């Protein structure tokens, strides 16, 4: 005879962005509105201190200065494919017997493994798009060292 | 001091596999395990053979 | 997998089996005896020291 010893499956890990450390750097909020968001904004207003000049020199008015920040939109998504056989099977049981029972639970574990390999995929993606975002944001060493 | 395993293991073939392997010259291990898994519909083994 | 942005294409789900296989290696020692180690291992030839 010849022997099969074991079949084997690869048990996944998962990931969610709040337990990453490079979430220190993200405020995390949501928004159900979000679609029908047009970019949002934020206001400052600061008025400098000056200094009281001596005798013969001119004098600094008082200025204001009141700048404007504004936010990003950068979407993600990911799809997950089933097949006909697999929805006819989930759907629908033709007989009792053993096999067809098979049939049916395997539709079923087909569906779910999808499910959770999308759902995994989503906190991913949200990790990567986020650090993208930083990357995109952050100059170099000899730039801000230079300021 | 390490602690090891003092003896060789023992794999053995149940009934099943006797059959098996007199019908179709072959063996699945754990023949009644997965058969038990299969009908019940559980998709993970405990273990491995 | 990992969710995609705009204008990046989307990675499908990939399902990848392998198969492994033994090997065999047999070992063989002799060891023998003469006829005399024999004959003197069963019979006492009138008992003597």
Redesign the interface.
Known sequence: ?????????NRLEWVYFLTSGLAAAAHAIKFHDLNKLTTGKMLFHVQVPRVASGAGLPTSRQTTIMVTKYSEK????????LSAACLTYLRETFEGT?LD??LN?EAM?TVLR?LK??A???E???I??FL?TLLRKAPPYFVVQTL | TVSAPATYGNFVLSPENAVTAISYHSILADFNSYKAHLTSGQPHLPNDS
Not at chain 1, 1 to 9: L, P, R, S, V
């Open positions: 005879f010849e022997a099969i010893f074991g079949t084997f499956c950068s979407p993600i998504t990911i799809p997950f494919e053993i029972k098979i639970v574990h999808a390999n999308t995994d995929a989503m991913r993606g949200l990567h798009s993208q």
